[PDB]
Amino acid sequence: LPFDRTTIM
Amino acid sequence: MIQRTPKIQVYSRHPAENGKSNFLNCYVSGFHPSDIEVDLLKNGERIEKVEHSDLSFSKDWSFYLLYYTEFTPTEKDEYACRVNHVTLSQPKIVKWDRDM
Amino acid sequence: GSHSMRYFYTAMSRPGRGEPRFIAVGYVDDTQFVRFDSDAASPRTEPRAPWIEQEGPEYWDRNTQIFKTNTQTYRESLRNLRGYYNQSEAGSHIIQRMYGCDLGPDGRLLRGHDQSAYDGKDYIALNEDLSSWTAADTAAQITQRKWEAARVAEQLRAYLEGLCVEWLRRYLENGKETLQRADPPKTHVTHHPVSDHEATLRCWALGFYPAEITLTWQRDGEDQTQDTELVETRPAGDRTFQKWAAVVVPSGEEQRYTCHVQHEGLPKPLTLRWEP
Numbered sequence: 001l002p003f004d005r006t007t008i009m
Numbered sequence: 010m011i012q013r014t015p016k017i018q019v020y021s022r023h024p025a026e027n028g029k030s031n032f033l034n035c036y037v038s039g040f041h042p043s044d045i046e047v048d049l050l051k052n053g054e055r056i057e058k059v060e061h062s063d064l065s066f067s068k069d070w071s072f073y074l075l076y077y078t079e080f081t082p083t084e085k086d087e088y089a090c091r092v093n094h095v096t097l098s099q100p101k102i103v104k105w106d107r108d109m
Numbered sequence: 110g111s112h113s114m115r116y117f118y119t120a121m122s123r124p125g126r127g128e129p130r131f132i133a134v135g136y137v138d139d140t141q142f143v144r145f146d147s148d149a150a151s152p153r154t155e156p157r158a159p160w161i162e163q164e165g166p167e168y169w170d171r172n173t174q175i176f177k178t179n180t181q182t183y184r185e186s187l188r189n190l191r192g193y194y195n196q197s198e199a200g201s202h203i204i205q206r207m208y209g210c211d212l213g214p215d216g217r218l219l220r221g222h223d224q225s226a227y228d229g230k231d232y233i234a235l236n237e238d239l240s241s242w243t244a245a246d247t248a249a250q251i252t253q254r255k256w257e258a259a260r261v262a263e264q265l266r267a268y269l270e271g272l273c274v275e276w277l278r279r280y281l282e283n284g285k286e287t288l289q290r291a292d293p294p295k296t297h298v299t300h301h302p303v304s305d306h307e308a309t310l311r312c313w314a315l316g317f318y319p320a321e322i323t324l325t326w327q328r329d330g331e332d333q334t335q336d337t338e339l340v341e342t343r344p345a346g347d348r349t350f351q352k353w354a355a356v357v358v359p360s361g362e363e364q365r366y367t368c369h370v371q372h373e374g375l376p377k378p379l380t381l382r383w384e385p
């Protein structure tokens with residue numbers, strides 16, 4: 001299962 | 010901008026045996042950026058039905074892909090892989106050699 | 110008995126040819142098990158190994174919701190990094206990310222990973238402490254500051270020590286017949302004259318899994334590192350891998366050369382020679 005939080009660079 | 014030219018290997022899935030159906034592989038790796046064109050050739054003509062793997066990359070960030078198609082090797086049929094990439098002036102052709 | 114899970118993300122801009130493509134693939138060891146491609150006719154997470162197919166609709170929808178959100182986020186990230194390097198709007202650029210967890214043979218978390226790259230260069234990596242960052246340059250320092258403010262490391266540590274390991278263990282159990290099966294190499298040595306005075310000995314390894322393998326040639330029992338031609342390990346297309354190592358030897362000193370093979374599938378390392 002992948003990491004669920006997106007965060008813009 | 011830093012670019013990496015593809016390594017190319019052409020080979021069969023199983024040991025080659027004339028008149029026995031097999032798979033012809035072309036493995037391209039170590040390249041960057043990811044855009045690449047790969048054709049499998051039979052006596053110089055582009056084979057139509059070729060499949061390939063999903064884009065992935067190695068620990069050094071270089072991409073790799075496997076292109077493959079069913080084929081039946083014979084004594085006289087010549088196979089090859091033709092590869093173009095931004096790093097190449099012209100398409101590179103690597104011939105299939107069963108001892109390689 | 111050591112195992113790992115990794116996800117590999119590739120985000121690629123293409124000015125004049127639509128919005129940036131995002132592709133994600135997931136692996137356990139050397140077995141790919143899922144893909145998502147924003148360029149697909151109907152973008153969804155798709156199974157790529159038989160043992161993942163048993164997961165139910167809520168798994169597939171959760172994956173797809175995550176990857177769709179990542180598609181949009183990476184497009185913003187690509188615009189941001191363009192700006193950080195004062196780059197023109199004309200060029201194609203790539204962000205890559207690889208993250209995941211390593212288990213020891215006892216199934217315990219060995220370490221976690223989260224690394225990103227821009228145009229093939231190290232950009233930012235989570236340190237082994239899962240708490241602090243290493244930034245490659247002043248551009249990546251900006252990302253680092255953003256990531257410190259949104260508590261990203263803390264989130265990743267929770268995932269890497271928690272869900273990552275839990276799901277990896279689930280996959281290992283569900284796929285145990287393949288993922289926990291090491292297939293040893295089938296080996297042989299070939300001989301081909303190059304000339305009157307020399308011949309190539311080529312040591313083959315076929316049909317092995319996982320890809321990790323060591324193939325060396327020795328002369329009189331010392332390693333022939335500089336004189337050995339060694340191809341990259343290559344996939345056969347049926348889950349297995351292939352490799353060979355070649356040395357050009359004087360005719361007929363063939364018997365002074367031995368090929369050595371180490372692989373997880375082998376209960377004894379192999380010593381082989383040419384058998385005329």
